[PDB]
From Swiss-Prot, chains A, B:
<comment type="similarity">
    <text>Belongs to the flavin oxidoreductase frp family.</text>
</comment>
<dbReference type="InterPro" id="IPR016446">
    <property type="entry name" value="Flavin_OxRdtase_Frp"/>
</dbReference>
<dbReference type="GO" id="GO:0052873">
    <property type="term" value="F:FMN reductase (NADPH) activity"/>
</dbReference>
<keyword id="KW-0521">NADP</keyword>
<dbReference type="InterPro" id="IPR029479">
    <property type="entry name" value="Nitroreductase"/>
</dbReference>
<keyword id="KW-0560">Oxidoreductase</keyword>
<keyword id="KW-0285">Flavoprotein</keyword>
<protein>
    <recommendedName>
        <fullName>FMN reductase (NADPH)</fullName>
        <ecNumber>1.5.1.38</ecNumber>
    </recommendedName>
</protein>
<comment type="function">
    <text>Reduces FMNH(2) to FMN, with NADPH as reductant. It also reduces nitroaromatic compounds, quinones and azo dyes.</text>
</comment>
<dbReference type="InterPro" id="IPR000415">
    <property type="entry name" value="Nitroreductase-like"/>
</dbReference>
<dbReference type="Pfam" id="PF00881">
    <property type="entry name" value="Nitroreductase"/>
</dbReference>
<comment type="subunit">
    <text>Homodimer.</text>
</comment>
<keyword id="KW-0288">FMN</keyword>
Amino acid sequence: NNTIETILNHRSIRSFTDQLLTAEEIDTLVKSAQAASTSSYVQAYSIIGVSDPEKKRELSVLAGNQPYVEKNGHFFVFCADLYRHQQLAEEKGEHISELLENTEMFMVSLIDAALAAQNMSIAAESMGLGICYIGGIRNELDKVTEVLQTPDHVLPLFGLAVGHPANLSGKKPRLPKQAVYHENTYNVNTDDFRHTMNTYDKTISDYYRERTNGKREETWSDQILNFMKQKPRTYLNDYVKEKGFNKN
Amino acid sequence: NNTIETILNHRSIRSFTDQLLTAEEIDTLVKSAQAASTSSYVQAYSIIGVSDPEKKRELSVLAGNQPYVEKNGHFFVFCADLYRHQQLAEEKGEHISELLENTEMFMVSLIDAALAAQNMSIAAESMGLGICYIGGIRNELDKVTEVLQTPDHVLPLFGLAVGHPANLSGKKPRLPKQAVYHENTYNVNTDDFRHTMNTYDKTISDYYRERTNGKREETWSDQILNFMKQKPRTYLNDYVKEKGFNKN
Ligand SMILES: Cc1cc2nc3c(=O)[nH]c(=O)nc-3n(C[C@H](O)[C@H](O)[C@H](O)COP(=O)(O)O)c2cc1C
Ligand SMILES: Cc1cc2nc3c(=O)[nH]c(=O)nc-3n(C[C@H](O)[C@H](O)[C@H](O)COP(=O)(O)O)c2cc1C
Ligand SMILES: [Cl-]
Ligand SMILES: [Cl-]
Protein backbone atom coordinates (compact mmCIF):
# COMPACT_ATOMS: atom_id res chain seq x y z
CA ASN A 1 0.00 0.00 0.00
CA ASN A 2 0.85 3.81 -0.31
CA THR A 3 1.64 4.27 3.47
CA ILE A 4 4.25 1.47 3.54
CA GLU A 5 5.72 2.81 0.25
CA THR A 6 6.05 6.29 1.86
CA ILE A 7 7.63 4.75 5.03
CA LEU A 8 10.16 2.69 3.00
CA ASN A 9 10.95 5.69 0.67
CA HIS A 10 12.27 7.79 3.62
CA ARG A 11 15.52 9.78 3.42
CA SER A 12 16.59 12.82 5.48
CA ILE A 13 16.15 16.06 3.52
CA ARG A 14 18.73 18.74 4.27
CA SER A 15 17.92 21.16 1.41
CA PHE A 16 14.58 22.96 1.48
CA THR A 17 12.92 25.79 -0.47
CA ASP A 18 11.97 29.04 1.36
CA GLN A 19 8.21 28.08 1.15
CA LEU A 20 6.79 28.10 4.69
CA LEU A 21 4.34 25.46 5.95
CA THR A 22 0.75 26.70 6.05
CA ALA A 23 -1.22 26.89 9.34
CA GLU A 24 -3.35 23.95 8.00
CA GLU A 25 -0.19 21.80 7.31
CA ILE A 26 1.21 22.63 10.84
CA ASP A 27 -2.20 21.78 12.36
CA THR A 28 -2.32 18.38 10.53
CA LEU A 29 1.33 17.60 11.57
CA VAL A 30 0.61 18.40 15.27
CA LYS A 31 -2.67 16.35 15.31
CA SER A 32 -0.82 13.45 13.59
CA ALA A 33 1.93 13.60 16.27
CA GLN A 34 -0.70 13.64 19.07
CA ALA A 35 -2.48 10.55 17.62
CA ALA A 36 0.48 8.28 18.59
CA SER A 37 0.08 5.77 21.46
CA THR A 38 1.09 7.16 24.87
CA SER A 39 2.14 5.22 28.06
CA SER A 40 -0.77 5.27 30.57
CA TYR A 41 -2.41 8.11 28.50
CA VAL A 42 0.17 10.55 30.06
CA GLN A 43 1.08 12.31 26.75
CA ALA A 44 4.43 13.29 28.38
CA TYR A 45 5.65 15.69 25.67
CA SER A 46 5.46 19.20 24.20
CA ILE A 47 6.16 20.49 20.69
CA ILE A 48 7.61 23.97 20.23
CA GLY A 49 7.09 25.38 16.73
CA VAL A 50 10.00 27.75 16.00
CA SER A 51 9.30 30.39 13.30
CA ASP A 52 11.15 33.39 14.90
CA PRO A 53 14.23 34.01 12.61
CA GLU A 54 16.50 34.86 15.57
CA LYS A 55 15.55 31.70 17.50
CA LYS A 56 15.86 29.43 14.39
CA ARG A 57 19.35 30.96 13.83
CA GLU A 58 20.46 30.44 17.46
CA LEU A 59 19.26 26.81 17.40
CA SER A 60 21.08 26.21 14.08
CA VAL A 61 24.35 27.51 15.70
CA LEU A 62 23.82 25.50 18.92
CA ALA A 63 23.10 22.40 16.74
CA GLY A 64 26.59 22.76 15.19
CA ASN A 65 25.74 25.13 12.25
CA GLN A 66 23.05 23.16 10.48
CA PRO A 67 21.52 25.55 7.86
CA TYR A 68 18.43 23.37 7.28
CA VAL A 69 17.36 24.33 10.88
CA GLU A 70 17.00 28.01 9.70
CA LYS A 71 16.01 27.35 6.06
CA ASN A 72 12.89 25.13 6.12
CA GLY A 73 9.05 25.33 6.11
CA HIS A 74 8.91 25.16 9.97
CA PHE A 75 11.21 24.01 12.80
CA PHE A 76 9.63 21.83 15.52
CA VAL A 77 11.35 21.10 18.85
CA PHE A 78 10.20 17.89 20.60
CA CYS A 79 10.45 17.96 24.40
CA ALA A 80 10.01 15.40 27.16
CA ASP A 81 7.36 17.15 29.32
CA LEU A 82 6.44 16.32 32.93
CA TYR A 83 5.82 20.01 33.81
CA ARG A 84 2.17 19.64 32.62
CA HIS A 85 1.79 16.81 35.23
CA GLN A 86 3.59 18.84 37.96
CA GLN A 87 1.24 21.85 37.33
CA LEU A 88 -1.90 19.65 36.91
CA ALA A 89 -1.22 18.28 40.46
CA GLU A 90 -0.54 21.80 41.91
CA GLU A 91 -4.04 22.82 40.68
CA LYS A 92 -5.42 20.02 42.94
CA GLY A 93 -3.25 21.11 45.88
CA GLU A 94 -0.68 18.31 45.33
CA HIS A 95 3.15 18.71 44.99
CA ILE A 96 4.33 15.56 43.09
CA SER A 97 7.78 16.59 41.58
CA GLU A 98 9.63 13.71 43.38
CA LEU A 99 7.34 11.20 41.54
CA LEU A 100 8.30 12.61 38.05
CA GLU A 101 12.09 12.39 38.53
CA ASN A 102 12.99 8.69 38.26
CA THR A 103 14.45 6.65 35.34
CA GLU A 104 11.02 5.10 34.59
CA MET A 105 9.35 8.52 33.98
CA PHE A 106 12.41 9.65 31.93
CA MET A 107 11.98 6.58 29.68
CA VAL A 108 8.19 7.19 29.48
CA SER A 109 8.56 10.83 28.38
CA LEU A 110 11.38 10.14 25.83
CA ILE A 111 9.40 7.28 24.21
CA ASP A 112 6.14 9.33 24.17
CA ALA A 113 7.88 12.30 22.44
CA ALA A 114 9.67 10.02 19.91
CA LEU A 115 6.43 8.17 18.90
CA ALA A 116 4.74 11.58 18.39
CA ALA A 117 7.74 12.84 16.29
CA GLN A 118 7.72 9.77 14.05
CA ASN A 119 3.95 10.15 13.43
CA MET A 120 4.66 13.79 12.43
CA SER A 121 7.52 12.62 10.14
CA ILE A 122 5.32 10.01 8.32
CA ALA A 123 2.45 12.54 8.02
CA ALA A 124 4.89 15.16 6.51
CA GLU A 125 6.44 12.63 4.10
CA SER A 126 2.95 11.45 2.95
CA MET A 127 2.25 15.14 1.94
CA GLY A 128 5.43 15.22 -0.20
CA LEU A 129 7.31 17.23 2.43
CA GLY A 130 10.87 16.42 3.54
CA ILE A 131 12.04 16.00 7.15
CA CYS A 132 15.31 15.91 9.10
CA TYR A 133 15.62 15.16 12.83
CA ILE A 134 18.07 17.49 14.66
CA GLY A 135 19.68 15.87 17.71
CA GLY A 136 22.45 18.49 17.39
CA ILE A 137 20.46 20.77 19.77
CA ARG A 138 21.69 18.38 22.59
CA ASN A 139 25.22 19.90 22.19
CA GLU A 140 24.10 22.88 24.34
CA LEU A 141 20.77 22.07 26.05
CA ASP A 142 21.27 24.84 28.73
CA LYS A 143 21.35 27.44 25.92
CA VAL A 144 18.49 25.68 24.01
CA THR A 145 16.28 25.85 27.19
CA GLU A 146 17.08 29.62 27.37
CA VAL A 147 16.11 30.13 23.65
CA LEU A 148 12.82 28.20 24.15
CA GLN A 149 12.26 29.42 27.79
CA THR A 150 11.41 25.85 28.84
CA PRO A 151 10.57 25.44 32.55
CA ASP A 152 11.74 22.71 34.95
CA HIS A 153 10.56 19.14 34.06
CA VAL A 154 10.82 20.02 30.33
CA LEU A 155 13.72 18.56 28.33
CA PRO A 156 14.29 19.45 24.61
CA LEU A 157 15.30 16.16 22.89
CA PHE A 158 15.63 17.00 19.17
CA GLY A 159 14.35 19.34 16.51
CA LEU A 160 12.47 18.30 13.37
CA ALA A 161 13.07 20.43 10.26
CA VAL A 162 10.08 20.13 7.88
CA GLY A 163 9.76 21.71 4.42
CA HIS A 164 9.40 21.49 0.63
CA PRO A 165 12.51 19.64 -0.62
CA ALA A 166 14.89 21.60 -2.94
CA ASN A 167 16.94 18.35 -3.45
CA LEU A 168 15.54 14.80 -2.91
CA SER A 169 18.94 13.22 -2.01
CA GLY A 170 18.93 9.38 -1.85
CA LYS A 171 18.16 6.46 0.48
CA LYS A 172 20.76 5.11 2.94
CA PRO A 173 20.95 1.28 3.29
CA ARG A 174 19.87 -0.15 6.63
CA LEU A 175 21.43 -3.07 8.56
CA PRO A 176 20.58 -6.55 7.17
CA LYS A 177 17.28 -7.83 8.64
CA GLN A 178 19.06 -10.64 10.57
CA ALA A 179 21.29 -8.07 12.44
CA VAL A 180 18.21 -6.24 13.85
CA TYR A 181 15.49 -8.94 13.97
CA HIS A 182 15.92 -11.96 16.29
CA GLU A 183 13.55 -14.92 16.67
CA ASN A 184 12.51 -15.57 20.31
CA THR A 185 15.91 -14.79 21.84
CA TYR A 186 18.70 -12.28 21.08
CA ASN A 187 21.24 -13.88 18.69
CA VAL A 188 24.75 -13.69 20.28
CA ASN A 189 26.39 -16.09 17.74
CA THR A 190 29.80 -14.52 16.82
CA ASP A 191 29.96 -16.10 13.33
CA ASP A 192 26.45 -14.75 12.52
CA PHE A 193 27.46 -11.30 13.84
CA ARG A 194 30.73 -11.17 11.80
CA HIS A 195 29.03 -12.35 8.57
CA THR A 196 26.22 -9.74 8.84
CA MET A 197 28.58 -6.89 9.89
CA ASN A 198 31.10 -7.75 7.10
CA THR A 199 28.26 -7.79 4.52
CA TYR A 200 26.90 -4.45 5.84
CA ASP A 201 30.36 -2.82 5.93
CA LYS A 202 30.86 -3.80 2.23
CA THR A 203 27.30 -2.48 1.35
CA ILE A 204 28.12 0.87 3.04
CA SER A 205 31.67 1.20 1.63
CA ASP A 206 30.24 0.45 -1.89
CA TYR A 207 27.42 2.97 -1.25
CA TYR A 208 29.91 5.78 -0.40
CA ARG A 209 32.20 4.85 -3.34
CA GLU A 210 29.15 5.04 -5.71
CA ARG A 211 27.66 8.25 -4.11
CA THR A 212 31.03 10.16 -3.91
CA ASN A 213 32.54 8.71 -7.18
CA GLY A 214 35.45 7.08 -5.25
CA LYS A 215 36.11 10.12 -3.01
CA ARG A 216 34.93 8.24 0.15
CA GLU A 217 35.12 4.47 0.93
CA GLU A 218 34.54 4.21 4.71
CA THR A 219 32.67 1.21 6.17
CA TRP A 220 29.71 1.60 8.59
CA SER A 221 31.62 0.21 11.62
CA ASP A 222 34.51 2.70 11.04
CA GLN A 223 32.05 5.64 10.53
CA ILE A 224 29.88 4.90 13.64
CA LEU A 225 32.88 4.40 15.94
CA ASN A 226 34.66 7.57 14.62
CA PHE A 227 31.63 9.77 15.36
CA MET A 228 30.63 8.04 18.68
CA LYS A 229 34.04 9.03 20.20
CA GLN A 230 33.53 12.75 19.23
CA LYS A 231 31.36 15.37 21.12
CA PRO A 232 30.15 12.60 23.56
CA ARG A 233 27.83 15.05 25.45
CA THR A 234 28.94 13.73 28.92
CA TYR A 235 27.48 16.93 30.58
CA LEU A 236 23.96 15.43 29.95
CA ASN A 237 24.56 12.90 32.82
CA ASP A 238 24.18 15.83 35.27
CA TYR A 239 22.23 18.29 33.07
CA VAL A 240 19.18 16.00 32.65
CA LYS A 241 19.07 15.64 36.53
CA GLU A 242 19.25 19.49 36.83
CA LYS A 243 16.05 19.62 34.71
CA GLY A 244 14.26 17.14 36.99
CA PHE A 245 14.78 13.84 35.15
CA ASN A 246 16.45 10.45 35.68
CA LYS A 247 17.46 11.12 39.33
CA ASN A 248 18.86 8.57 41.88
CA ASN B 1 -4.59 11.73 2.60
CA ASN B 2 -4.93 7.92 3.40
CA THR B 3 -1.72 7.74 5.54
CA ILE B 4 -2.87 10.72 7.67
CA GLU B 5 -6.36 9.13 7.97
CA THR B 6 -4.73 5.89 9.24
CA ILE B 7 -2.51 7.88 11.70
CA LEU B 8 -5.51 9.86 13.07
CA ASN B 9 -7.74 6.69 13.25
CA HIS B 10 -5.35 4.98 15.74
CA ARG B 11 -6.59 3.23 18.89
CA SER B 12 -4.83 0.48 20.90
CA ILE B 13 -6.21 -3.01 20.05
CA ARG B 14 -6.38 -5.42 22.98
CA SER B 15 -8.46 -8.23 21.41
CA PHE B 16 -7.00 -10.20 18.49
CA THR B 17 -8.02 -13.32 16.53
CA ASP B 18 -5.71 -16.40 16.66
CA GLN B 19 -4.58 -15.72 13.01
CA LEU B 20 -0.76 -15.45 13.04
CA LEU B 21 1.15 -12.89 10.95
CA THR B 22 2.71 -14.37 7.81
CA ALA B 23 6.52 -14.34 7.23
CA GLU B 24 5.88 -11.72 4.46
CA GLU B 25 3.88 -9.47 6.87
CA ILE B 26 6.64 -9.75 9.57
CA ASP B 27 9.27 -8.98 6.87
CA THR B 28 7.33 -5.84 5.73
CA LEU B 29 6.84 -4.69 9.39
CA VAL B 30 10.59 -5.13 10.19
CA LYS B 31 11.72 -3.30 7.00
CA SER B 32 9.20 -0.50 7.81
CA ALA B 33 10.60 -0.20 11.37
CA GLN B 34 14.21 -0.11 10.01
CA ALA B 35 13.33 2.70 7.50
CA ALA B 36 12.92 5.24 10.35
CA SER B 37 15.55 8.00 10.78
CA THR B 38 18.41 7.05 13.15
CA SER B 39 20.82 9.34 15.15
CA SER B 40 24.24 9.40 13.39
CA TYR B 41 23.16 6.26 11.37
CA VAL B 42 23.82 4.16 14.54
CA GLN B 43 20.55 2.11 14.37
CA ALA B 44 20.85 1.56 18.17
CA TYR B 45 18.10 -1.03 18.53
CA SER B 46 17.07 -4.67 18.12
CA ILE B 47 13.65 -6.26 17.59
CA ILE B 48 12.93 -9.68 19.10
CA GLY B 49 10.02 -11.46 17.42
CA VAL B 50 8.40 -13.72 20.03
CA SER B 51 6.37 -16.61 18.57
CA ASP B 52 7.32 -19.35 21.13
CA PRO B 53 4.06 -19.95 23.14
CA GLU B 54 5.95 -20.43 26.43
CA LYS B 55 7.90 -17.16 26.01
CA LYS B 56 4.72 -15.17 24.93
CA ARG B 57 3.00 -16.56 28.07
CA GLU B 58 5.89 -15.68 30.43
CA LEU B 59 6.03 -12.13 28.97
CA SER B 60 2.21 -11.67 29.41
CA VAL B 61 2.63 -12.68 33.12
CA LEU B 62 5.70 -10.41 33.62
CA ALA B 63 3.76 -7.56 31.90
CA GLY B 64 1.08 -7.83 34.63
CA ASN B 65 -1.19 -10.52 33.02
CA GLN B 66 -1.96 -8.86 29.71
CA PRO B 67 -3.62 -11.60 27.56
CA TYR B 68 -3.14 -9.72 24.27
CA VAL B 69 0.70 -10.24 24.72
CA GLU B 70 0.03 -14.02 24.36
CA LYS B 71 -3.01 -13.97 22.02
CA ASN B 72 -1.99 -11.95 18.91
CA GLY B 73 -0.52 -12.40 15.36
CA HIS B 74 3.07 -11.82 16.62
CA PHE B 75 4.73 -10.24 19.67
CA PHE B 76 7.67 -7.90 18.96
CA VAL B 77 10.02 -6.72 21.74
CA PHE B 78 11.86 -3.44 21.02
CA CYS B 79 15.26 -3.13 22.69
CA ALA B 80 17.79 -0.33 23.09
CA ASP B 81 20.93 -1.99 21.61
CA LEU B 82 24.52 -0.79 22.11
CA TYR B 83 25.89 -4.38 22.21
CA ARG B 84 26.27 -4.33 18.39
CA HIS B 85 28.49 -1.21 18.80
CA GLN B 86 30.48 -2.69 21.76
CA GLN B 87 31.16 -5.91 19.70
CA LEU B 88 32.18 -3.92 16.57
CA ALA B 89 34.57 -1.83 18.79
CA GLU B 90 36.05 -5.00 20.45
CA GLU B 91 36.78 -6.61 17.01
CA LYS B 92 38.68 -3.40 16.02
CA GLY B 93 40.67 -2.89 19.24
CA GLU B 94 38.65 0.24 20.14
CA HIS B 95 37.11 0.99 23.59
CA ILE B 96 33.74 2.83 23.76
CA SER B 97 32.18 0.84 26.72
CA GLU B 98 32.28 3.95 29.00
CA LEU B 99 30.56 6.19 26.36
CA LEU B 100 27.87 3.52 25.80
CA GLU B 101 27.16 3.94 29.55
CA ASN B 102 26.40 7.69 29.47
CA THR B 103 22.97 9.43 29.44
CA GLU B 104 23.48 10.66 25.83
CA MET B 105 23.78 7.10 24.40
CA PHE B 106 20.84 5.93 26.56
CA MET B 107 18.69 8.75 25.00
CA VAL B 108 20.01 7.90 21.48
CA SER B 109 19.06 4.21 21.80
CA LEU B 110 15.67 4.83 23.42
CA ILE B 111 14.71 7.37 20.62
CA ASP B 112 16.05 5.14 17.77
CA ALA B 113 14.00 2.13 19.05
CA ALA B 114 10.83 4.26 19.53
CA LEU B 115 11.00 5.78 15.98
CA ALA B 116 11.38 2.24 14.55
CA ALA B 117 8.40 0.98 16.66
CA GLN B 118 6.12 3.81 15.50
CA ASN B 119 7.00 3.09 11.83
CA MET B 120 6.07 -0.58 12.48
CA SER B 121 2.80 0.55 14.19
CA ILE B 122 1.77 2.78 11.21
CA ALA B 123 2.75 0.07 8.71
CA ALA B 124 0.64 -2.53 10.67
CA GLU B 125 -2.36 -0.16 10.99
CA SER B 126 -2.21 0.67 7.24
CA MET B 127 -2.60 -3.14 6.54
CA GLY B 128 -5.76 -3.23 8.70
CA LEU B 129 -3.90 -4.87 11.60
CA GLY B 130 -4.27 -3.71 15.22
CA ILE B 131 -1.42 -2.83 17.59
CA CYS B 132 -0.85 -2.34 21.31
CA TYR B 133 2.43 -1.15 22.89
CA ILE B 134 3.39 -3.14 26.04
CA GLY B 135 5.48 -1.14 28.52
CA GLY B 136 4.32 -3.60 31.19
CA ILE B 137 7.42 -5.77 30.47
CA ARG B 138 9.36 -3.05 32.45
CA ASN B 139 7.69 -4.33 35.69
CA GLU B 140 10.25 -7.18 35.79
CA LEU B 141 13.12 -6.47 33.32
CA ASP B 142 15.53 -8.98 35.07
CA LYS B 143 13.13 -11.82 34.22
CA VAL B 144 12.36 -10.35 30.72
CA THR B 145 16.14 -10.30 29.86
CA GLU B 146 16.27 -14.01 30.99
CA VAL B 147 13.24 -14.94 28.75
CA LEU B 148 14.82 -13.12 25.76
CA GLN B 149 18.46 -14.01 26.67
CA THR B 150 19.53 -10.42 25.96
CA PRO B 151 23.26 -9.70 26.49
CA ASP B 152 24.85 -6.72 28.26
CA HIS B 153 24.20 -3.29 26.59
CA VAL B 154 20.76 -4.54 25.44
CA LEU B 155 17.68 -3.18 27.23
CA PRO B 156 14.10 -4.37 26.48
CA LEU B 157 11.90 -1.22 26.43
CA PHE B 158 8.42 -2.36 25.42
CA GLY B 159 6.62 -5.01 23.47
CA LEU B 160 4.36 -4.42 20.47
CA ALA B 161 1.40 -6.83 20.13
CA VAL B 162 0.32 -6.98 16.46
CA GLY B 163 -2.62 -8.92 14.98
CA HIS B 164 -6.01 -9.15 13.28
CA PRO B 165 -8.47 -7.25 15.52
CA ALA B 166 -11.36 -9.27 17.05
CA ASN B 167 -12.79 -5.96 18.51
CA LEU B 168 -12.04 -2.44 17.13
CA SER B 169 -12.57 -0.59 20.46
CA GLY B 170 -12.75 3.26 20.15
CA LYS B 171 -10.53 6.38 19.97
CA LYS B 172 -9.32 8.17 23.14
CA PRO B 173 -9.36 12.03 22.96
CA ARG B 174 -5.98 13.75 23.06
CA LEU B 175 -5.00 16.96 24.88
CA PRO B 176 -6.19 20.19 23.16
CA LYS B 177 -3.57 21.33 20.60
CA GLN B 178 -2.73 24.48 22.73
CA ALA B 179 -1.69 22.27 25.68
CA VAL B 180 0.97 20.39 23.61
CA TYR B 181 1.96 22.85 20.84
CA HIS B 182 3.76 26.09 21.74
CA GLU B 183 4.89 28.95 19.45
CA ASN B 184 8.57 29.97 19.81
CA THR B 185 8.68 29.58 23.62
CA TYR B 186 6.97 27.23 26.11
CA ASN B 187 3.69 28.74 27.36
CA VAL B 188 3.81 28.96 31.20
CA ASN B 189 0.72 31.27 31.49
CA THR B 190 -1.35 29.90 34.45
CA ASP B 191 -4.73 31.17 33.14
CA ASP B 192 -4.09 29.47 29.75
CA PHE B 193 -3.06 26.24 31.55
CA ARG B 194 -6.18 26.17 33.79
CA HIS B 195 -8.55 26.89 30.86
CA THR B 196 -7.03 24.12 28.64
CA MET B 197 -6.87 21.57 31.52
CA ASN B 198 -10.51 22.36 32.60
CA THR B 199 -11.68 21.87 28.97
CA TYR B 200 -9.74 18.57 28.68
CA ASP B 201 -10.90 17.34 32.10
CA LYS B 202 -14.55 17.85 31.01
CA THR B 203 -13.90 16.11 27.60
CA ILE B 204 -12.40 13.09 29.45
CA SER B 205 -15.02 12.90 32.24
CA ASP B 206 -17.78 13.10 29.51
CA TYR B 207 -15.91 10.41 27.50
CA TYR B 208 -15.87 7.90 30.42
CA ARG B 209 -19.52 8.68 31.32
CA GLU B 210 -20.52 7.66 27.73
CA ARG B 211 -18.04 4.68 27.47
CA THR B 212 -19.16 3.04 30.79
CA ASN B 213 -22.72 4.57 31.04
CA GLY B 214 -22.30 6.73 34.20
CA LYS B 215 -20.33 4.08 36.16
CA ARG B 216 -16.99 5.94 35.58
CA GLU B 217 -16.59 9.73 35.52
CA GLU B 218 -12.91 10.43 36.31
CA THR B 219 -11.18 13.45 34.78
CA TRP B 220 -7.76 13.28 33.09
CA SER B 221 -6.27 15.10 36.18
CA ASP B 222 -7.73 12.38 38.50
CA GLN B 223 -6.34 9.67 36.29
CA ILE B 224 -2.81 11.21 36.05
CA LEU B 225 -2.78 11.89 39.84
CA ASN B 226 -3.74 8.24 40.55
CA PHE B 227 -1.17 7.00 37.99
CA MET B 228 1.60 9.12 39.64
CA LYS B 229 0.80 7.80 43.14
CA GLN B 230 0.96 4.13 41.87
CA LYS B 231 3.67 1.53 42.87
CA PRO B 232 6.73 3.10 41.14
CA ARG B 233 9.24 1.12 39.05
CA THR B 234 12.06 2.67 41.17
CA TYR B 235 14.26 -0.48 40.75
CA LEU B 236 14.97 0.68 37.13
CA ASN B 237 17.28 3.47 38.47
CA ASP B 238 19.76 0.69 39.44
CA TYR B 239 18.65 -2.06 37.02
CA VAL B 240 19.31 -0.09 33.78
CA LYS B 241 22.92 0.59 35.19
CA GLU B 242 23.32 -3.19 35.74
CA LYS B 243 22.68 -3.65 31.98
CA GLY B 244 25.34 -1.06 31.09
CA PHE B 245 23.04 1.91 30.49
CA ASN B 246 22.70 5.16 32.33
CA LYS B 247 25.68 4.17 34.65
CA ASN B 248 26.98 7.74 34.03
C1 LIG C 1 5.49 2.86 25.39
C2 LIG C 1 4.05 2.47 25.60
C3 LIG C 1 3.74 1.45 26.49
C4 LIG C 1 2.39 1.02 26.66
N1 LIG C 1 2.18 -0.09 27.50
C5 LIG C 1 0.95 -0.57 27.59
C6 LIG C 1 0.69 -1.81 28.35
O1 LIG C 1 1.56 -2.37 28.96
N2 LIG C 1 -0.59 -2.23 28.30
C7 LIG C 1 -1.63 -1.67 27.64
O2 LIG C 1 -2.74 -2.21 27.69
N3 LIG C 1 -1.44 -0.49 26.96
C8 LIG C 1 -0.24 0.04 26.87
N4 LIG C 1 0.01 1.17 26.13
C9 LIG C 1 -1.12 1.78 25.40
C10 LIG C 1 -1.53 3.09 26.06
O3 LIG C 1 -2.25 2.74 27.24
C11 LIG C 1 -2.46 3.81 25.09
O4 LIG C 1 -1.69 4.19 23.94
C12 LIG C 1 -3.14 5.07 25.74
O5 LIG C 1 -4.12 4.64 26.72
C13 LIG C 1 -3.89 5.92 24.66
O6 LIG C 1 -4.88 5.08 24.08
P1 LIG C 1 -4.93 4.86 22.50
O7 LIG C 1 -3.60 4.16 22.05
O8 LIG C 1 -5.99 3.76 22.33
O9 LIG C 1 -5.12 6.14 21.71
C14 LIG C 1 1.31 1.69 25.97
C15 LIG C 1 1.62 2.77 25.09
C16 LIG C 1 2.96 3.18 24.89
C17 LIG C 1 3.24 4.27 23.98
C1 LIG D 1 17.03 11.62 16.96
C2 LIG D 1 17.75 11.92 15.66
C3 LIG D 1 18.65 12.97 15.61
C4 LIG D 1 19.27 13.34 14.39
N1 LIG D 1 20.08 14.50 14.39
C5 LIG D 1 20.56 14.90 13.24
C6 LIG D 1 21.28 16.19 13.15
O1 LIG D 1 21.49 16.88 14.15
N2 LIG D 1 21.68 16.54 11.88
C7 LIG D 1 21.47 15.83 10.74
O2 LIG D 1 21.87 16.31 9.66
N3 LIG D 1 20.83 14.63 10.77
C8 LIG D 1 20.35 14.15 11.91
N4 LIG D 1 19.64 13.00 11.97
C9 LIG D 1 19.41 12.23 10.72
C10 LIG D 1 20.29 10.97 10.73
O3 LIG D 1 21.56 11.37 10.45
C11 LIG D 1 19.78 10.07 9.60
O4 LIG D 1 18.42 9.69 9.94
C12 LIG D 1 20.72 8.81 9.36
O5 LIG D 1 21.91 9.28 8.70
C13 LIG D 1 20.03 7.83 8.37
O6 LIG D 1 19.81 8.58 7.13
P1 LIG D 1 18.35 8.66 6.44
O7 LIG D 1 17.49 9.40 7.48
O8 LIG D 1 18.67 9.61 5.31
O9 LIG D 1 17.89 7.27 6.08
C14 LIG D 1 19.05 12.54 13.17
C15 LIG D 1 18.17 11.44 13.25
C16 LIG D 1 17.54 11.10 14.48
C17 LIG D 1 16.64 9.91 14.51
CL1 LIG E 1 22.87 14.30 16.99
CL1 LIG F 1 3.69 0.67 30.95
